Design a protein around this ligand. Structure first.
Ligand SMILES: C[C@H]1O[C@@H](n2cnc3c(N)ncnc32)C[C@@H]1OP(=O)(O)OP(=O)(O)OP(=O)(O)O
Ligand SMILES: C[C@H]1O[C@@H](n2cnc3c(N)ncnc32)C[C@@H]1OP(=O)(O)OP(=O)(O)OP(=O)(O)O
Ligand SMILES: [Cl-]
Ligand SMILES: [Cl-]
Ligand SMILES: [Mn+2]
Ligand SMILES: [Mn+2]
Lengths: 163, 166
């Protein structure tokens, strides 16, 4: 479609809950070790689901996938790993959305990138939220969804938690 | 706090999502590409280094607080002058500046002072440059500041006095 800027991509954001407080409690040396380990785990899981880490945001990542099932499986695997590690507790919120986005270098721009970020911002620590398009596109179980408004967007959006 | 002393500046466009929605992706990408070019130019003029882009804003490192503050002043000026001439859609940008030790890892920066700089920027109004007390105090010797405001910052136990550039 000529009027369409940008190509379809699934965008996933992760974000550690209360990372600043954690950093203050454990100190910078321990924080650097922690985020280094976390980066490696996330990187490895993304690679397993054929995604690409676009960038780090300090205590989380922006990630691109071709298919929604890849992004959701990556999220499920990360949450499972964070739970496993805590029984030796970093909590992460994950949001997933899909739509056209504009590529510039390795980065992605446009309203669907913003949407993915707000879906993630809506998620509780330990939760994976996905937008309706992702839910509709998808051995994965979802809740019945919840209506929310997102910062910068008009109207309401139904977001679905992975169960 | 660990690592080498550095000044950290964050920029962030106010309500960029609403703007993107209003003008559409074609216009947004043109705007953000032009904004990136402007910021990159001003950063280079003050010997700074852009660490990363965060969509509608940048994380920038400087050796000296005067460089970071001069950069913020030049940016706010350019943005106001550009908006006044309809050079691009009006954008208002928040700017926060903090200094202290942070850990280098690759080309990124980590630690509580990075988080502090991000929170200082988050407190700034669109069109404002807010700096932490160490930055204000470091410039005590043609840059003027207000009398500061005391604020709580998420994730920090303290109360912190933040100063706007006048
Ligand atoms: C205070 C903000 O600092 C961000 N931050 C830390 N290091 C970096 C970095 N190297 N690059 C970019 N950003 C960085 C992450 C942190 O933002 P939040 O995730 O909003 O803070 P926090 O995790 O404390 O609170 P919540 O996520 O629970 O809201
Ligand atoms: C909704 C979130 O999407 C962020 N965003 C958009 N594109 C990118 C990108 N390529 N890389 C990283 N982040 C991106 C910016 C936006 O976050 P905010 O700046 O908090 O949104 P907004 O400008 O609407 O809110 P305020 O700055 O007014 O709080
Ligand atoms: Cl939101
Ligand atoms: Cl003017
Ligand atoms: Mn966080
Ligand atoms: Mn913004």
């Amino acid at each position: 479609f000529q009027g369409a800027m940008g190509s379809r991509v699934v965008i996933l954001f992760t974000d550690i809950e209360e990372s600043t407080a954690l950093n203050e409690r454990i100190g910078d040396r321990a924080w650097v070790k922690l985020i280094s380990s976390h980066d490696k785990l996330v990187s490895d899981l993304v690679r397993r689901q054929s995604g690409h880490v676009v960038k780090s945001q300090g205590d989380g990542f922006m990630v691109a996938f071709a298919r929604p099932e890849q992004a959701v499986r990556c999220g499920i695997e990360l949450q499972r790993a964070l739970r496993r590690n805590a029984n030796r507790e970093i909590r992460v919120r994950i949001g997933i959305h899909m739509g056209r986005s504009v590529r510039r270098g390795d980065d992605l721009f446009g309203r669907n990138v913003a949407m993915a970020a707000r879906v993630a911002a809506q998620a509780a620590g330990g939760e994976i939220l996905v937008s309706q398009p992702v839910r509709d596109a998808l051995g994965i179980r979802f809740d019945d969804g919840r209506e929310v408004e997102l910062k910068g967007f008009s109207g309401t959006y139904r977001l679905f938690a992975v169960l």
